[PDB]
């Protein structure tokens, strides 16, 4: 039947205050989080950001949601999750995250009979990945993903991984939208950040990347080299042909100029010199020698 289950639900929400965390007086709430990266989105190098599509899972113990019926686990609808207390986990470095609403809110709620909740969401986090482009394009990055609680200090809501920290953040096999980089591995960690309001627990996850040097080789180095060779050919010409050697020199110098300009446009407007900048500077010097 379904009236026994309607009665169970109405008994659960009868006398429930969703403004109070579970165990407000004599307990610190323990949120066991977890992540399943369905697809590592494209690392935008211009904005120093990166997109990642996750199945963000959380699970706390609410003693005010104990029941006793025919079923053990109530796999409820995602609209019940708005009538109970759910931790306000926010991403410390996320820029513009979206929660999907197609076709219904991509959420889940499983209430175990002893109160153990489970609440998963499907997110698309656009986090910040500060990059030191001093080895461009032979650089390797560690893009972090820090998430913690808002409005709940460390004395109230503590976060913890649900499995061994090495096995919590899982990445799907086919989930790699990286065309330029190469995902090496994840690395999780848990710390405590001070603030002006209190001490908060912060869970961190670095995804180590490693840039692929194929596209930059093909489109900067080869053209640079070929231009140096094309400039170096002007020596085997005889000394009587001044027009030709002059054309060689001028054209090559201006091809190196336009190559430097076109090579610098791809990167962010950074204020130091990369490795590609040194290679292009040396080839420019060669054509001017």
């Amino acid at each position: 039947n379904t009236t026994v289950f309607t009665r169970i639900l109405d008994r659960l929400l009868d006398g429930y205050d969703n403004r109070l965390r579970p165990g407000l007086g004599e307990r610190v709430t323990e949120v066991k989080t977890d992540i399943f990266v369905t697809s590592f989105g494209p690392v935008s190098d211009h904005d120093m950001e990166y997109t990642i599509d996750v199945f963000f899972r959380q699970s706390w113990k609410d003693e005010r949601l104990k029941f006793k019926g025919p079923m053990t686990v109530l796999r409820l609808n995602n609209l019940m999750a708005s009538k109970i207390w759910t931790p306000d986990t926010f991403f410390h470095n996320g820029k513009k995250s979206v929660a999907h609403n197609m076709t219904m809110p991509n959420k889940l709620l499983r209430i175990t009979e002893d109160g153990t909740l489970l609440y998963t969401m499907r997110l698309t986090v656009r986090a910040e990945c500060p990059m030191h482009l001093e080895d461009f394009p032979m650089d390797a990055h560690a893009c972090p993903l820090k998430f913690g609680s808002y409005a709940y200090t460390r004395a109230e809501v503590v976060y913890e991984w649900t499995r061994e920290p090495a096995r919590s953040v899982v990445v799907a096999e086919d989930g790699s939208r990286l065309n330029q980089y190469d995902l090496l591995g994840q690395t999780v960690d848990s710390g405590i950040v001070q603030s002006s309001t209190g001490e908060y627990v912060v869970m961190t996850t670095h995804f180590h990347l490693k840039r692929k040097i194929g596209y930059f080789v093909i489109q900067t180095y080869l053209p640079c080299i070929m231009t140096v060779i094309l400039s170096q050919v002007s020596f085997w010409l005889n000394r009587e042909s001044v027009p030709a050697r002059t054309v060689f020199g001028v054209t090559t110098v201006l091809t190196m100029t336009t190559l430097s300009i076109s090579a610098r446009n791809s990167l962010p407007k950074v204020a130091y010199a990369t490795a590609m900048d040194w290679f292009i500077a040396v080839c420019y010097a060669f054509v001017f020698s």
């Epitope: 153990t116 503590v158 913890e160 991984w161 061994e164 920290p165 090495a166 690395t187 960690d189 848990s190």
Partner: antibody, heavy 117, light 106 residues
Framework: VQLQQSGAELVKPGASVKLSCTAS????????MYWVKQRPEQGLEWIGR????????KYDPKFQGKATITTDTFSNTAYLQLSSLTSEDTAVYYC???????????WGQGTSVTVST | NIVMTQSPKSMSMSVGERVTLSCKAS??????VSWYQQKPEQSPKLLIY???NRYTGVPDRFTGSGSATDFTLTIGSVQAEDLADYHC????????FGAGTKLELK
């Protein structure tokens, strides 16, 4: 809060011993339950853990098949059964629960098994 | 399998002096290194859960210091009941403990 292990066992080499660990003060469905061995005057060694909410048990690669870990949610007990034992595993077996930052805060007391004839 | 090389093997030190123990992990373990104090004929007791977090009931003379691989346990004014084994164990992966350091008085 209080983990009570079994008593000492005197088992013949080639038999199976089943050690029990009764947890009083909490529910085992909330945390994991680790089993540790310690030979005399040596370092601690991990055997395996069990998630009592599901039954997912992981073992140390050098203890796979030799040991098995089961649970009993009604009495809040963890059982460790040594399937086939030689005369070398005459160690002290501890039962611990995972703590706050994945440490093992509460340990048992140790059931010193003895293998001889 | 992450292995924890704990040093030194066995040290002897007098009362009231600062002492330090080192625990170097093979692979990366973020801050999931715990320090346990096992007195003879007793079960190990957790001292430092995570790196640099004293457990409830531990005197303030014990301090942890964490990193990615290297970890340190410093005891300050050492009393006469701190003569026990001191194991370091990571938990970032399946837990593996160190060999332990037999602290002695002389």
């Amino acid at each position: 809060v209080q983990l009570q292990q079994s008593g000492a066992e005197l088992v013949k080499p080639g038999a199976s011993v089943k050690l029990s660990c009764t947890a009083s003060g909490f529910n085992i469905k909330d945390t994991y339950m680790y089993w540790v061995k310690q030979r005399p005057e040596q370092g601690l060694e991990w055997i395996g853990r069990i998630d009592p909410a599901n039954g997912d048990t992981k073992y140390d690669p050098k203890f796979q098949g030799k040991a098995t870990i089961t649970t009993d949610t009604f009495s809040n007990t963890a059982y460790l059964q040594l399937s086939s034992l030689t005369s070398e595993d005459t160690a002290v077996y501890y039962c611990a629960r995972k703590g706050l930052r994945w440490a093992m805060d509460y340990w048992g007391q140790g059931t010193s098994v003895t293998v001889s004839t | 399998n992450i292995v924890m090389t704990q040093s030194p093997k066995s040290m002897s030190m007098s009362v009231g002096e600062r002492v330090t123990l080192s625990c170097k992990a093979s692979e990366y373990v973020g801050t999931y290194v715990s320090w346990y104090q096992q007195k003879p004929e007793q079960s190990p007791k957790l001292l430092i859960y995570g790196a640099s977090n004293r457990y409830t009931g531990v005197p303030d003379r014990f301090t942890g210091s964490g990193s990615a691989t290297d970890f340190t346990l410093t005891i300050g004014s050492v009393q006469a009941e701190d003569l026990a084994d001191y194991h370091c164990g990571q938990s970032y992966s399946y837990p593996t403990f160190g060999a332990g350091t037999k602290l002695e008085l002389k």
